[PDB]
Write a protein that binds this ligand. Structure first.
Ligand code: SF4
Ligand code: SF4
Ligand code: FES
Ligand SMILES: [K+]
Ligand SMILES: [Zn+2]
Lengths: 115, 89, 124, 696, 112, 64
C-alpha cells in the first residue's frame, strides 16, 4: 500500500518551536499552490484574492496557545491541503468557500422576528 | 429633621445590605435607628430595603429621569453614612 | 349557508346531497370533530385552482353509518360481550355493563348494547 | 432511634417505626407497589409489596410492616417472585383489554409492573367473562372508566385525608365493591383533579385531555405555575407548538406534588382569545397593523396628548413577568414619570404593608415551616380558594397534631376546623387581647396570616396596625430563628412588583388625571380610572377588558412561551422555562417595552435577556438567586413592623371580605379556558354545587 | 479542562454565542411511582425564541430550524456533565434536582 | 453524542448559481423524540454470577 500524493504521516509534535516551523512550511505550500487552485477549480477570482483568503484563515488561529490544539489544527490543515491539491473537492465546494458573503439594530431584528 | 429632608430630585432610595457578616453592621444599625426619622421628613419618598447574603453595603439613589447613582458604604462608620446620604442631595 | 359547512354538529339540520362537493362527506354536511378542518375551507386553496373536485377522495362519514345500526338488546343478562363480530379479525374482546337505563356503545366498534327491559325507555 | 436492618445484604438505617418499603428505597432496593404512596395513609389492600422476613413463616407487606433492629429482609427470593406473579395474575384477571383505547397506555404502572414482575402469559380463558362496572359521573374534570380500577383506594385516601372531601368512598362488598360516590353527584374539591395523577390505572383520567395524546409524544418542561402566588412547580407537557397538559412536580417546600384544578386545567385557554397581531383602533373597530406601524402610532399618540411628569400611568396585571415590570418602570422613569401601580383596588394609595420592607409583604415563615406551626391566625383570608395547596398543608398539620387555627373575617367552607371569632377589626382587637392572643404568645412557633384582600378593604390600615403592635410587643413572634408574620397573596406578580418598588407611595401622584396609560396585562380596571380622552396601550397575550379599553394593542407571550422571573408569596425567586413559541407575531413582553422605548426617545440600555436580568440585580440583589428565599434580618424586620404601628388611626368596623368571587375566573387565561366554563356550570363559583346540571 | 476543545470539534459557532444548554436531573413523573429516569444527569438546549416550531401549510407538519431540538445527552454524574459542558465552551446553567424530605410512615399512624 | 443526528446543513440546487450549494438545515417535519417514552422502571435485575470457581477470592475458614 502506497500513500496518495501529498500525504503526510501523522505525528504529535511535543515542541512548540518545532510546531511553528511546520505551520510556516505549510503556509508557504498554500501560497505556492494558489494559482493551481484557481486553474483546477476554475475560480472567478485571481490568485491574489486566494492568497488573501488563505492568510485570513491562518490568522484566525494565530493566537492559539495550547500545544495539543495546535497538533489537531495542523493535522486538519494538512488534510485540507491534500484535499485541494489532489482535486478531490468538487468545484462547487470551492466556489461556495469563496462565496462567504454592519449588523441590524435591535428594532430591525425586533420587527422581523430576530432569533 | 436636619438634612434628612431629601430634595425633589431624589425619588427612590435603595439600601443593599447582607443579613450576616461584619461589614453590614454599621449600615444595619444606622437603618434601624434613623429610618423612622428619615421617613418622617419624607412621608411619600420610597425607601426600599433589600437584603442578600454576602453583598457589600451600598445605597442606590434614583434621581430625575430615571438616573441612578450608586455609592458603596463598605468600612464606613455610622456618621459617615449619614453624611453620604446628605451629599446625594 | 357556510355555517353548517364549517361547524361541528351532532346532526345535520338538513339532508346531505351526494352530488354536493362542499360537504364534509358525501353522506354528511358538517364536520364531526372540533379540530376537523372543514372541507370547504380546505378546498379553497391555490392547489385546487385547476383541479376537478369530483375525483378527489371523499369517503363516507363513519359517524353517520354507525348510527344506522340498530341497538343490540340483551335478554336476561346485564353484561354485553363484543369482539368486532369477526373474532381473530376484529378487536380485543371487551365487556360492557348494561345496568344503566340507556344504550352504551362499544369502545372499538361503536355498536350500542342495552337490556331489553329498557327498550321502551330508550326508543322514546 | 436509628435501627440497623438488612435488605438483600445491604445495611440500612432509618427512624424507628419506618416501613420496610421506606428502608428498601433508602437502600436502593426497588419493591413493586400499587396501593402505597409516600403521601397517603398506609393501606395493605394490594399485596404487591410482599417481602420475606428472615426468621418468620409469613410474608409481610413492606408498606405496613414496621422496621426492627436486626431485621433482615429478602426481596428477591423465588418465593417472592411467585407472590409477585400470583398477585399480578389476580389484578389482570378481571381487568379489561382496554390499553389501545385507554389514556394511561404509555404511563401505566399496571402495565410496567406486570411486565417487570408478572408473567408473560395469562391463563384466564373463562367463558363467563370478566366483571363489568358502570361508569360513575363525578363532574366534567374526572373521566371514569371503572372497569380498569384495581381497588387500591388511593383516590379514597387522598380525597378524605388530603383534599378533605368525604363524598368519595368505597361502596359494596367483595367483587361487587365499586369506587365512587354511591349517589349521583360530583366531587367538590379544588384539589380533586390530583386524583387523576394518583390513580395508577386508567380508571380515573383527565376529561379535557382524553384521547388527545400519548405520553411518549410529549415534551416535558419544568416550569412554575402563575395562576396563584404560591409558585407551584409544574411539568408542562407539549406536543410541538401546543401545550397538551400540565402536571405537578415534586417540591416539598412549595407545592408537594399537588396543584389546584385551576392550575392544570386552564392550559386550554392558551388556544383561545389570544393576541397574535398588533391592533390599531379606528373609531369603533380594531384593525390589524405591523409592529412598525403599531409602535409608530403609539409614538404619534404620545405626542398628540403631550403628557407631563405624572400624566404617564403604568398598570401591571397579575400575570406580568418581572423583566417587563422593571423595563416598564425604567421607561416610565426615563419619561420623568412615577405613576406606576398594579391593577388592584387598594384603598390607601400606599398599601398598608408598604414596600420599604420585604418582611411586611412576604410569607416570612416560609411554606415549609407550616409543618412546625402550633398556632395559626387567619385574618380576612380564604386559603382554600386563594392558595389551594397551602390550605391542604395546614389540614395535614392539623390532622397530625393539636394545631389550632383561628379565623377573623368572612366565614367560608373549610377543610379543617376554624375557631371563628368575628368579621371586622373589632373582633381582631378582642382576640389579640383575649384568650386568642394568649395562645399565640405561649405558642412556640406561632403563625399569623393576613389575606391579600385586607388591603382592598376600608379597614386595611387598622388590620396591619393591630397585628404589628401585637407582633412587636410579643417577643416570641419575632426571634433570630422564627418570624410569625406572613402575608398570603393571590397574584404571582405582586411580590415581584413590590421587590422592585413598582408602586406609588405618594397620594398626590396617584390622583393625577393620566393622559397616556400603558396597560401591561392589566384587566381589573373597572374601578380604576381611565379618562375617555386618554391614550391607552395594552400589552398582553389575551384579548379581554384590557384589550377593549386600548387604542393600540401590543401582543405579548404567555408564561409558557418565555423565560420569565416570578417571585412568590414567600419571597422565593423562580424562573419560568419556555416550552413553545408565542403565536402569530407576538413578542417577548420585555422586548416590546425596549423596542417602544426607542420610538419614544428613551432607548433603554438593555439588548439581551442577560443584560435585562443584570438590571434586576441592580434594582434588587436577591432577584438573581433562583429557588432561594433571602430572609429579612431580625433587627430590620422589627423596624418594618414598628413602622406599621400607626397611632391615631380609627377602625371603621367593616367586613374583611374574601377577595376571590369565582374560583375558576381569576385571570385572563382562566377566563378564556373552555374547561373553566364547564367548571362554573357544574361545580359553581364557590365549588358548592353537589349536583351536575350540565351532565346528562 | 481549560482546553478550548470547541476549536477542533467542528460544531458551528452558534452553539457558543447564541444557544443555552441546561444541565438537569429529570424529575419524577407525577403519574408513575418509578424513579429509574431520575438516576442520570442530562443536557438539553433551550428552544429558539423563533423558529423552534412552525406549522407546514401543505400537511400540517411540525417544521423546525433548531438542529439541537432532538439532542439529549446522558451523563452518569453531575461532575461529568459540567466537565463536558466546560470542555465544549457552552453557555449553560444547572437546575439542582429537588430532594424529597423523609417522613416516617407506619400503619399504626392510621389510628395514632 | 453531541453531534445532532440531522447535522447542521443541507444541500440543494441553486438556479441562480447553476450549482449545488450548502444551506443551513431546515426540516419540513422536525424529528419527533419518542425516546422520552422509556420505561420509568428498571427492566433487568442485577443478573446471575457466572464467575468460575477458580477465579473467586477465597473465604477464610471460620473460627476454631
Ligand atoms: S389501565 Fe393500564 S393495563 Fe389497564 S387498560 Fe389502561 S393501559 Fe392497559
Ligand atoms: S380508582 Fe384508581 S386511585 Fe381509586 S382505588 Fe381504583 S385504581 Fe386506586
Ligand atoms: S404496596 Fe404494600 S400492600 Fe400495597
Ligand atoms: K390515572
Ligand atoms: Zn366491539
Amino acid at each position: 500500500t502506497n500513500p496518495t500524493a501529498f500525504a503526510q504521516t501523522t505525528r504529535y509534535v511535543k515542541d512548540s518551536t518545532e510546531m511553528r516551523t511546520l505551520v510556516l512550511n505549510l503556509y508557504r505550500r498554500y501560497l505556492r499552490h494558489s494559482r493551481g487552485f484557481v486553474n483546477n477549480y476554475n475560480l472567478d477570482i485571481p490568485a491574489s484574492q486566494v492568497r488573501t483568503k488563505i492568510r485570513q484563515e491562518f490568522e484566525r488561529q494565530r493566537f492559539v496557545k495550547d500545544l495539543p490544539l495546535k497538533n489537531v489544527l495542523y493535522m486538519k490543515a494538512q488534510m485540507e491541503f491534500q484535499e485541494l491539491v489532489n482535486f478531490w473537492k468538487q468545484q462547487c465546494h470551492v466556489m461556495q468557500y469563496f462565496e462567504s458573503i454592519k449588523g441590524d439594530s435591535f428594532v430591525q431584528k425586533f420587527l422581523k422576528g430576530a432569533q | 429633621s436636619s438634612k434628612f429632608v431629601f430634595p425633589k430630585v431624589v425619588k427612590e432610595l435603595r439600601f443593599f445590605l447582607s443579613q450576616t457578616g461584619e461589614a453590614s453592621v454599621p449600615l444595619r444599625s444606622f437603618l434601624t435607628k434613623t429610618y423612622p426619622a428619615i421617613k418622617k421628613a419624607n412621608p411619600t419618598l420610597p425607601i426600599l430595603i433589600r437584603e442578600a447574603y454576602g453583598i457589600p453595603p451600598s445605597v442606590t439613589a434614583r434621581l430625575e429621569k430615571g438616573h441612578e447613582v450608586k455609592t458603596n458604604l463598605e468600612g464606613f462608620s455610622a456618621d459617615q453614612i449619614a453624611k453620604t446620604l446628605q451629599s446625594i442631595a | 349557508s357556510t355555517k353548517e359547512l364549517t361547524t361541528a354538529r351532532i346532526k345535520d339540520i338538513s339532508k346531505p346531497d351526494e352530488n354536493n362537493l362542499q360537504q364534509q362527506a358525501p353522506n354528511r354536511i358538517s364536520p364531526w370533530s372540533k379540530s376537523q378542518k372543514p372541507r370547504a375551507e380546505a378546498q379553497d386553496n391555490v392547489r385546487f385552482a385547476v383541479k376537478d373536485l369530483a375525483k378527489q377522495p371523499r369517503p363516507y362519514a363513519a359517524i353517520d353509518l354507525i348510527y344506522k345500526q340498530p341497538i343490540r338488546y340483551i335478554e336476561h343478562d346485564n353484561v354485553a360481550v363484543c369482539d368486532g363480530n369477526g373474532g381473530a379479525q376484529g378487536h380485543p374482546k371487551v365487556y360492557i355493563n348494561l345496568d344503566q337505563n340507556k344504550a352504551i356503545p362499544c369502545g372499538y366498534c361503536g355498536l350500542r348494547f342495552a337490556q331489553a327491559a329498557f327498550k321502551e325507555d330508550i326508543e322514546s | 432511634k436509628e435501627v440497623e436492618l438488612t435488605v438483600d445484604g445491604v445495611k440500612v438505617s432509618i427512624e424507628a417505626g419506618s416501613s420496610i418499603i421506606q428502608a428498601a428505597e433508602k437502600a436502593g432496593v426497588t419493591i413493586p407497589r400499587y396501593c402505597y404512596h409516600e403521601k397517603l395513609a398506609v393501606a395493605g389492600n394490594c399485596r404487591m409489596c410482599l417481602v420475606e422476613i428472615e426468621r418468620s413463616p409469613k410474608l409481610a407487606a413492606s408498606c405496613a410492616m414496621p422496621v426492627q433492629n436486626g431485621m433482615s429482609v429478602l426481596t428477591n427470593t423465588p418465593k417472592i417472585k411467585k407472590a409477585r406473579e400470583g398477585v399480578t395474575e389476580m389484578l389482570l384477571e378481571n381487568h379489561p383489554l382496554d390499553c389501545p383505547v385507554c389514556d394511561q397506555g404509555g404511563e401505566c404502572d399496571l402495565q410496567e409492573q406486570s411486565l417487570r414482575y408478572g408473567s408473560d402469559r395469562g391463563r384466564f380463558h373463562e367463558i363467563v367473562g370478566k366483571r363489568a362496572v358502570e361508569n360513575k359521573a363525578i363532574g366534567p374534570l374526572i373521566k371514569t372508566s371503572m372497569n380498569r380500577c384495581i381497588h387500591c383506594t388511593r383516590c379514597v385516601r387522598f380525597l378524605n385525608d388530603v383534599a378533605g372531601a368525604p363524598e368519595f368512598g368505597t361502596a359494596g362488598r367483595g367483587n361487587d365493591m365499586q369506587i365512587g360516590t354511591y349517589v349521583e353527584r360530583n366531587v367538590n374539591s379544588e384539589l380533586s383533579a390530583n386524583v387523576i395523577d394518583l390513580c395508577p390505572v386508567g380508571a380515573l383520567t383527565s376529561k379535557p385531555y382524553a384521547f388527545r395524546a400519548r405520553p411518549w409524544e410529549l415534551k416535558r418542561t419544568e416550569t412554575i405555575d402563575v395562576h396563584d402566588a404560591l409558585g407551584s412547580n409544574v411539568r408542562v407537557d407539549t406536543r410541538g407548538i401546543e401545550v397538551m397538559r400540565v402536571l405537578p412536580r415534586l417540591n416539598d417546600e412549595i407545592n408537594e406534588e399537588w396543584i389546584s384544578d385551576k392550575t392544570r386545567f386552564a392550559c386550554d385557554g392558551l388556544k383561545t382569545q389570544r393576541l397574535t397581531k398588533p391592533l390599531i383602533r379606528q373609531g369603533n373597530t380594531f384593525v390589524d397593523a405591523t409592529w412598525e406601524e403599531a409602535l409608530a402610532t403609539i409614538a404619534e399618540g404620545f405626542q398628540k396628548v403631550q403628557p407631563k411628569e405624572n400624566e404617564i400611568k403604568a398598570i401591571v396585571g397579575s400575570l406580568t413577568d418581572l423583566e417587563s415590570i422593571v423595563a416598564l418602570k425604567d421607561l416610565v422613569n426615563k419619561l420623568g414619570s412615577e405613576n406606576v401601580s398594579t391593577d388592584g383596588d387598594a384603598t390607601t394609595v400606599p398599601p398598608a404593608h408598604g414596600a420599604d420592607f420585604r418582611s411586611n409583604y412576604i410569607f416570612n415563615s416560609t411554606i415549609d415551616n407550616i409543618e412546625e406551626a402550633d398556632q395559626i391566625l387567619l385574618v380576612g383570608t380564604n386559603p382554600r380558594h386563594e392558595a389551594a395547596v397551602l390550605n391542604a398543608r395546614i389540614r395535614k398539620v392539623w390532622l397530625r397534631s393539636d394545631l389550632e387555627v383561628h379565623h377573623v373575617g368572612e366565614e367560608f367552607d373549610s377543610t379543617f376546623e376554624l375557631n371563628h371569632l368575628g368579621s371586622d377589626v373589632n373582633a381582631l382587637a378582642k382576640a389579640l387581647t383575649g384568650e386568642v392572643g394568649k395562645k399565640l404568645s405561649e405558642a412556640s412557633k406561632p403563625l399569623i396570616i393576613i389575606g391579600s384582600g385586607v388591603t382592598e378593604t376600608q379597614d386595611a390600615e387598622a388590620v396591619y396596625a393591630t397585628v404589628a403592635k401585637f407582633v412587636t410587643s410579643n417577643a416570641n413572634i419575632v426571634t433570630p430563628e422564627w418570624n410569625g408574620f406572613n402575608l398570603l397573596h393571590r397574584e404571582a406578580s405582586r411580590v415581584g412588583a413590590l421587590d422592585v418598588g413598582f408602586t406609588t407611595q405618594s397620594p398626590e401622584v396617584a390622583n393625577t388625571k393620566a393622559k397616556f396609560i400603558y396597560l401591561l396585562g392589566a384587566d381589573e380596571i373597572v374601578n380604576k380610572d381611565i379618562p375617555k380622552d386618554a391614550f391607552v396601550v395594552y400589552q398582553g397575550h389575551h384579548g379581554d377588558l384590557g384589550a377593549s379599553f386600548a387604542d393600540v394593542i401590543l401582543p405579548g407571550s404567555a408564561y409558557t412561551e418565555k423565560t420569565a422571573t416570578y417571585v412568590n408569596t414567600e419571597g422565593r425567586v423562580q424562573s419560568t422555562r419556555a416550552a413553545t413559541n408565542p403565536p402569530g407575531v407576538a413578542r417577548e413582553d420585555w422586548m416590546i417595552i425596549r423596542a417602544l422605548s426607542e420610538y419614544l426617545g428613551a432607548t433603554l440600555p438593555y439588548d439581551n435577556l442577560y443584560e435585562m436580568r443584570s438590571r434586576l440585580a441592580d434594582v434588587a440583589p436577591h432577584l438573581l438567586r433562583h429557588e432561594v428565599v433571602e430572609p429579612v434580618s431580625e433587627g430590620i424586620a422589627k423596624v418594618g413592623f414598628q413602622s406599621l404601628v400607626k397611632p391615631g388611626i380609627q377602625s371603621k368596623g367593616v367586613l374583611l371580605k374574601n377577595p376571590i368571587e369565582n374560583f375558576y375566573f381569576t385571570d385572563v387565561i382562566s377566563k378564556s379556558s373552555p374547561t373553566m366554563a364547564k367548571c362554573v356550570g357544574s361545580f359553581g363559583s364557590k365549588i358548592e354545587k353537589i349536583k351536575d346540571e350540565k351532565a346528562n | 479542562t481549560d482546553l478550548a476543545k470547541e476549536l477542533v470539534s467542528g460544531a458551528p459557532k452558534e452553539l457558543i454565542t447564541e444557544r443555552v444548554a441546561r444541565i438537569y436531573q429529570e424529575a419524577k413523573a407525577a403519574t408513575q411511582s418509578g424513579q429509574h429516569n431520575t438516576e442520570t444527569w442530562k443536557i438539553d438546549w433551550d428552544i429558539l425564541n423563533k423558529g423552534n416550531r412552525w406549522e407546514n401549510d401543505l400537511m400540517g407538519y411540525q417544521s423546525s430550524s433548531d438542529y439541537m431540538q432532538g439532542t439529549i445527552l446522558k451523563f452518569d454524574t453531575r461532575e461529568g456533565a459540567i466537565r463536558f459542558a466546560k470542555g465544549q465552551g457552552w453557555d449553560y446553567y444547572i437546575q439542582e434536582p429537588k430532594v424529597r424530605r423523609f417522613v416516617k410512615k407506619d400503619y399504626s399512624a392510621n389510628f395514632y | 453524542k453531541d453531534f445532532p443526528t440531522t447535522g447542521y446543513t443541507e444541500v440543494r440546487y441553486d438556479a441562480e448559481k447553476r450549482r449545488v450549494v450548502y444551506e443551513p438545515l431546515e426540516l419540513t417535519q422536525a424529528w419527533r423524540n419518542f425516546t422520552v417514552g422509556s420505561s420509568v422502571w428498571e427492566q433487568v435485575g442485577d443478573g446471575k454470577d457466572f464467575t468460575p470457581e477458580s477465579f473467586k477470592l477465597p473465604t477464610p475458614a471460620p473460627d476454631p
